[PDB]
Design a protein around this ligand. Structure first.
Ligand SMILES: OC[C@H]1O[C@@H]2O[C@H]3[C@H](O)[C@@H](O)[C@@H](O[C@H]4[C@H](O)[C@@H](O)[C@@H](O[C@H]5[C@H](O)[C@@H](O)[C@@H](O[C@H]6[C@H](O)[C@@H](O)[C@@H](O[C@H]7[C@H](O)[C@@H](O)[C@@H](O[C@H]1[C@H](O)[C@H]2O)O[C@@H]7CO)O[C@@H]6CO)O[C@@H]5CO)O[C@@H]4CO)O[C@@H]3CO
Length: 372
């Protein structure tokens, strides 16, 4: 039997359908009392919302894969048991297992495969127009945010640099302090004068108002964007960009969204938390998330289901996941410093706060900063 009381943290707009998933959980585990709330500062802040006060934080909480190495090293999450690991590995696609694995051990329960794509109004741009960045932006406005390093750091990967080495595990392996890194900086700077590129803190709202023909966004907004665009909805994988005169695919990050179990819980509450985390990341639950938000399951069976297999967003995400089209977000403990420093590096190049004469210096400083 499973008994106990557990608190579950999800994002604000996910609460209604996680209550449905928890109702399904309670059909099987009637004696577990679950309280579902939104998290204090959203899934993007999980490591900080938990770490501020582990005993007060949720027992099961939503967290993206990049945060897991920090939380594992800090002791906030324990490794999954051998049986739990076996189930994650058997049930989900390989990149989901890689996403939750730190130094050979799994630390979370994966549920969604995330890659940004182009979402666009097909009455304003054609499928051919969206194949190249310059061609798209010559024909319509793409709204985006150069202050968000998740959006734009992968241009450095398109440029041929590595982030924490070959597989994202090498502390000193970021090599953007190079001519290749400068090519990416120059690309950001070029976009400031591209009249088809609109800087905004809310690209989705510019799509909704009709001021943008296209945005870069992820599958957490798939259903939202389908509603906004209606019969004009279209999606495509990321386009090519020109770096040093060559056309190369513009990358996105590949992220894996997960639930983790707070290591504070003990006794029956710990068992209940692990059971809940397994359940809410199972195939049925992933498909409920898909039905509501359009997020893409990591479950092998769910991905091949007719419903997901026919969704154009799923197809674009599966393209994005291929080598060369994205890179899995690393999960080094240094990732907080990486994100903090990457955003001003990129935005400084875009706005001109960092002029070309400073690219090499700033990239050298960046590598030192993120490699401690
Ligand atoms: O912008 C939307 C976001 O805004 C608000 O969050 C605050 C947040 O509370 C602050 O802590 C801070 O965020 C920091 C993070 O703390 C820091 O870790 C880092 O974040 C990086 C993430 O760790 C990394 O995973 C990735 O984030 C992706 C993520 O993988 C995607 O799943 C997707 O996340 C969605 C979130 O799950 C969701 O909560 C919401 O996020 C809000 C948040 O709720 C709100 O309170 O929507 C997003 C999708 O739009 O996308 C994110 C990328 O945006 O990359 C980030 C780095 O970009 O750095 C951030 C920023 O410095 O600040 C934000 C407000 O800016």
């Amino acid at each position: 039997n499973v008994s106990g009381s557990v608190k579950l943290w999800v994002d604000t707009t996910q609460v209604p359908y996680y209550k449905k998933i928890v109702a399904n959980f309670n059909k099987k585990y009637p004696d577990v009392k679950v309280k579902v709330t939104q998290s204090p500062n959203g899934s993007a802040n999980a490591k900080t919302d938990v770490g501020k006060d582990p005993a007060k934080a949720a027992d099961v909480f939503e967290v993206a894969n990049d945060q897991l190495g920090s939380m594992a090293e800090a002791g906030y999450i324990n490794p999954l048991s051998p049986d739990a690991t076996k189930a994650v590995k058997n049930n989900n696609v390989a990149v989901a297992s890689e996403g939750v694995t730190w130094k050979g051990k799994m630390f979370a329960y994966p549920f969604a495969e995330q890659a940004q794509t182009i979402y666009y109004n097909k009455s304003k741009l054609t499928a051919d127009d969206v194949k190249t960045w310059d061609g798209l932006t010559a024909k319509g406005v793409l709204a985006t945010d150069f202050t968000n390093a998740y959006n734009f750091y992968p241009v450095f990967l398109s440029a041929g640099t590595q982030l924490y080495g070959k597989t994202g595990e090498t502390v000193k392996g970021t090599d953007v302090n190079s001519a290749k890194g400068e090519q990416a900086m120059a690309w950001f700077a070029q976009q400031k004068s591209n009249k088809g590129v609109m800087q905004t803190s809310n690209a989705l709202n510019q799509l909704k108002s009709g001021k943008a023909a296209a945005i870069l966004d992820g599958p957490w907004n798939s259903a939202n964007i389908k509603k906004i665009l209606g019969k004009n909805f279209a999606v495509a994988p990321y386009p090519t960009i020109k770096l040093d005169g060559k056309d190369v695919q513009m990358q996105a990050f590949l992220g894996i969204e997960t639930f983790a179990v707070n290591s504070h819980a003990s006794g029956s509450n710990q068992k209940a938390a692990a059971t809940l985390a397994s359940f809410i990341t199972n195939k049925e639950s992933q498909l409920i998330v898909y039905d509501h938000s359009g997020q893409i399951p990591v479950d092998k069976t769910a991905q091949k289901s007719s419903k997901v297999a026919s969704d154009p967003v799923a197809g674009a995400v599966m393209t994005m996941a291929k080598p060369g089209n994205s890179t899995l977000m690393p999960k080094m403990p240094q990732m907080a410093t990486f994100w903090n420093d990457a955003a001003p590096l990129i935005n400084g190049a875009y706005t001109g706060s960092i002029p070309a004469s400073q690219y090499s210096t700033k990239l050298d400083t960046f590598v030192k900063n993120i490699s401690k």
